[PDB]
Symmetry: C3
Subunit: 114 residues, 3 copies
């Protein structure tokens, strides 16, 4: 699976260990081995949420399976939790798009997962 | 809903009120309250359209509902209009990906919209 | 169609001609006229793959049609080949999300492709 967070929070406010913590926590949350987890953080963005430029984040989680009503609620609690504690972003200023990708539609290592 | 514009236009050429205008125009266009609108502008990008590095933009609009054939035509006229007026990007050098998201697949405020 | 690559490889390591090569090769591979191909490269990203910050990439290819099991395998071989040769990124550290977009959901030139 892969997780991306885009935020207006400045690079200096992203703590050491953040990508590692996302990697570990997402492995645990999704049940994908950590070797598979891709994470990507994009600070210093020009973004607004409700017309306000206070800290916010626009994120995505793509996975082959492990995506669903209850699971996505759980991921959102985990991830908003991390963004609040680590980046000081209010959970109500975070959106996370979830994508259940078909294996045929995910490329890797010169091929796809199909 | 959330709107993202990625462009090779330089940051200095993005007008100061651009995020606020997008927010207001999208609230009007989608009928969603302005409090929910997220907007994200990413200038200075290394991109090409048809092999040319003249101004261009790659955009997305995600919404829970309010996505469809006629609506997307209307959004495309509105958004190309704004990109042309404010960023001086030709409409034929703009792509906008529209996504009709399920409420269960949009995380917000420690949960999802489901 | 449109191709985006986000990578932690630094800007200076992206060779001259890279976007043109992607344009040409994607025209050949997808069959789409070169004039319609959009390409976007985002270097210097803060990312990890399997907990490691060695070179990696997260990519996407959106197309109206020309997406499927065999086709995506072919795209993946092409694109991982290019990322390896040009950016020195190992194929097993690349993910590519493939999207078969409905024409009504792709805006261009004040309207959509529908
Ligand atoms: S993960 O193990 O689910 C692999 C993956 C899935 C979807 C997009 C990118 C990577
Ligand atoms: S909007 O009010 O439609 C909320 C939203 C929908 C989809 C993605 C992100 C945010
Ligand atoms: S391409 O010729 O397929 C046009 C396109 C399709 C999907 C997204 C963006 C552009």
């Amino acid at each position: 699976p892969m997780f991306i967070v885009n935020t207006n929070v400045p690079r200096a406010s992203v703590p050491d260990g953040f990508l590692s913590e996302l990697t570990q926590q997402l492995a645990q949350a999704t049940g994908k081995p950590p070797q598979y987890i891709a994470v990507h953080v994009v600070p210093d963005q020009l973004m607004a949420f409700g017309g306000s430029s206070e800290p916010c984040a626009l994120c995505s989680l793509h996975s082959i399976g492990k995506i669903g009503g209850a699971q996505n609620r759980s991921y959102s609690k985990l991830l908003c939790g991390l963004l609040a504690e680590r980046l000081r972003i209010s959970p109500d200023r975070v959106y996370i798009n979830y994508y259940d990708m078909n294996a045929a539609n995910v490329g890797w290592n010169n091929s796809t997962f199909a």
